């Protein structure tokens, strides 16, 4: 048991790597997207802004027209440590991308709604002058 633990747990330290390494792989796909999506939402936000503009004009037109075993076991830890730093790297990129976009969602939701109203009002004045 004594050795079945100083080695088995040692295998866990070795595994402790792929465990925190597979996490990076899982983090990459996330970050890679969070970044890709970040730029996407930029062109997406343009939509809420593009519509925000046109609607103003559209409304006006509708208004104008409407009217050594332990030595290694100690090293593996250092390995985990070096990787722990990485976990911080992603934790920040993921964090700064989350907070920057959440607030972006706010602006999107705002303008989107603001324009929704203009569409409804215009749709109630246009539907009548149909055909």
């Amino acid at each position: 048991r004594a050795d079945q633990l100083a080695d088995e747990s040692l295998e866990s330290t070795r595994r402790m790597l792929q465990l925190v390494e597979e996490s990076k792989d899982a983090g990459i796909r996330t970050l890679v997207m969070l970044d890709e999506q970040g730029e996407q939402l930029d062109r997406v936000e343009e939509g809420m802004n593009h519509i925000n503009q046109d609607m103003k004009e559209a409304e006006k037109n509708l208004k104008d027209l409407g009217k050594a075993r332990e030595n290694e076991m100690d090293e593996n830890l250092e390995q985990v440590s070096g990787i722990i730093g990485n976990l911080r790297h992603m934790a920040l990129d993921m964090g700064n991308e989350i907070d920057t976009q959440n607030r972006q969602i706010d602006r999107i939701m705002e303008k989107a709604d603001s324009n929704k109203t203009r569409i409804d009002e215009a749709n109630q004045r246009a539907t009548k002058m149909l055909g």
């Binding site: 004594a2 866990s12 899982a26 796909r29 999506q37 997406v44 939509g47 519509i51």
Partner: protein, 66 residues
């Protein structure tokens, strides 16, 4: 010295333990973020396109007054 060798193991496992679970989270993570990634691929679609629907409307309205 035995005492230190046994106490060592005790702390090592308690360590090994906390580890395995943290790994469990990323697994579920990659399954969540991805499940959300597809929920945005349609957004970008419905957005830049809605810009076309609105653009076509604002254009027709202008050429309906001049």
């Amino acid at each position: 010295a035995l005492s230190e060798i046994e106490t060592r193991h005790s702390e090592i496992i308690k360590l090994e333990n906390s580890i395995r679970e943290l790994h469990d989270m990323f697994m579920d993570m990659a399954m969540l973020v991805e499940s959300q990634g597809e929920m945005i691929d349609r957004i970008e679609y419905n957005v830049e396109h809605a810009v076309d629907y609105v653009e076509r409307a604002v254009s027709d309205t202008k050429k309906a007054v001049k």
